[PDB]
Amino acid sequence: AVKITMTSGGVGKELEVLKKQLEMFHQQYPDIEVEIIPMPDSSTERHDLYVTYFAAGETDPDVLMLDVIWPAEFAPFLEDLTADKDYFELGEFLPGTVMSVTVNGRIVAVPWFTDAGLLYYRKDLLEKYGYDHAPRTWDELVEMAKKISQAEGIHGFVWQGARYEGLVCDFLEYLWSFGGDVLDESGKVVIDSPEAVAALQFMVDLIYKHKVTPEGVTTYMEEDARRIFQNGEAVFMRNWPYAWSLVNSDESPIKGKVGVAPLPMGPGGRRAATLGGWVLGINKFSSPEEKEAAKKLIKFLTSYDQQLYKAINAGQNPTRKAVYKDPKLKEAAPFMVELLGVFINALPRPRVANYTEVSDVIQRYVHAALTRQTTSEDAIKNIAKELKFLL
C-alpha cells in the first residue's frame, strides 16, 4: 500500500541476496512495497549520482545505501535518526560502526555491513612451493609471488589500481604499514614524508621492477581482481570479504584452495587494513509516510537473522556483535570470526565533510605514479600541496 525505493549495488552476489531479503521482508510487511534502483560498481561514481539526487530535491530514492566515507558530507540531506537509537537497537552494534554514522552527535544512518582489506592467497600453490604460511611482510609476499608466478605462468598479485575510490583504500594500506599517514591527530597534513614516498614507490615497483603485478592493474576495480584470482590466474589478491562468497563457491575453479589472512606488515613495523562498509540512510525529502516505511525496512535488513543471511550468502561482515557468536557464520566464512581483530582495528579514511575532494587529489597523483606519468616524490609532493589548500 506504501511504495518506497532503495538503491543497491551489483557487486558480487549482493543484489541477488537483497532480492531474496526483500521477499522475506514482504512476508512480514505486505503493506510495504520496495523497488530496487541499481547503482554503478564505483563508489566515486555512486557519490556523484547521490549529489544530483539531493540537488534536485528528489523524493526518490527513499533508502540510501551509503559508503561509510559519506555521512559527514551527506548529513544535511539525511533523516535524523538519533531519536530512533533504541528502535534500531544500536547498542547491539559494533561501537566503531555506530561512531561512523554519528555526525555532530546526530545519528544519520544505520550500519549495514562492515569491511576491511584482506589478503587472499592460493593455499595449494604456497604449499607446493615450500611455504607453510601466508606472507607476514610485504617483502615476503613479493618473494613468494615472484617464485610461484614464473613457475606457474600466472600473475603474482592483483589488487585495485583503477582511478577511483578503491585505489585510495589500497594506497592507504601501504602508506600506513610503511609508517606514514595523511593527517595527524589534529588537522595537519603530514603525508609529505619519506615513508609516504617509499610506500608509493613500492606500489610502482610491484608492476615495473618486481613484475608481480600486471600493468593492467591501473584499470582494475574489486571485480576485475576477483575474476582473475577466481580463474586461477593470480597467486595473491587484496580484496574485501565479499570475494570469499564467490571464489569458494561450487562455481569457482579454485574452491577449497583459497586461504584468507591479514595484509602483510610493512617497514613501519605494523600491518594495516582500510576500514570500509556501507550504511543505510533515509532521504530527507521523502514524505513522512515513506520515511516510516523506510525505517521498517532498515530495521528488518539490519536485524540479527538478516545480517546472518547476508553474511553467509554475500560474504559481507555483520555489524551486530552477537552474530559473530553464531556457529553458522563460522561454518560459512571462518575468517569473519577468526580475523575479527582486523575489522575492529581497521583504520578509517579522514572524516571530513569534503573527503571526496581529498580522495580525488589522492586518486590523480597516485594513479599518475602507477602509470609512470610522474615520480613517487612528485606525486607525494603534489598531494601534500593540494591537500593543504583543501584543509
Ligand X SMILES: OC[C@H]1O[C@H](O[C@H]2[C@H](O)[C@@H](O)[C@@H](O)O[C@@H]2CO)[C@H](O)[C@@H](O)[C@@H]1O
Taking the CA atoms of the chain, what radius of gyration do you get in angstroms?
21
- The single residue among 33, 41, 89, 124 that binds ligand X, judged by CB under 6 A, is 41
Q: Name the one range near ligand X by CB under 6 A: 9-17, 52-60, 280-288, 337-345.
A: 9-17
Binding of ligand X by 169 (CB under 6 A): yes
User: Could you tell me how many residues make up the chain?
Assistant: 391
For β-strands 155-158 and 234-239, DSSP reports them as parallel
Q: Is 60 annotated among the ligand-binding residues?
A: yes
Q: Name the one range near ligand X by CB under 6 A: 64-72, 77-85, 288-296, 338-346.
A: 64-72
Q: Is 290 annotated among the ligand-binding residues?
A: yes
* Shortest distance (Å) from residue 121 CB to ligand X: 19
Binding of ligand X by 360 (CB under 6 A): no
Residue pair 253/231 in contact (Cβ under 8 Å)? The answer is: yes
- Cell digits of residue 388: 593543504
Q: What distance in Å separates the CA atoms of residue 266 and residue 380, rounded to the nearest whole number?
A: 19
Site for ligand X in 319-358 (CB under 6 A): none
- Cell digits of residue 46: 555512486
Query: Within a 13 Å sphere around the CA of 379, how many CA atoms are in the beta-carbon half?
Result: 25
Residue 67 binds: one of Mg ion, ligand X, none (C-beta under 5 to 8 A by kind) = ligand X
Q: Which residues bind Mg ion (CB under 5 A)?
A: 59-60, 62, 290
Binding of ligand X by 11 (CB under 6 A): yes
Q: What distance in Å separates the CA atoms of residue 61 and residue 44, rounded to the nearest whole number?
A: 18
* Shortest distance (Å) from residue 172 CB to ligand X: 11
**Residue 340: exposed, middle, or buried by beta-carbon count in 10 A (0-12, 13-18, 19+)?**
middle
**Residue 76: count of CB within 10 angstroms of its CB:** 10
Closest by CA to 367, choosing from 220, 230, 253, is 220
Site for ligand X in 101-130 (CB under 6 A): 115
Q: Name the one range near ligand X by CB under 6 A: 61-69, 150-158, 337-345, 382-390.
A: 61-69
Q: Which residues bind ligand X (CB under 6 A)?
A: 9, 11, 14, 41, 43, 67-69, 115, 165-166, 169, 222, 240, 242, 276-278, 316
Binding region for Mg(2+): 59-60, 62, 290
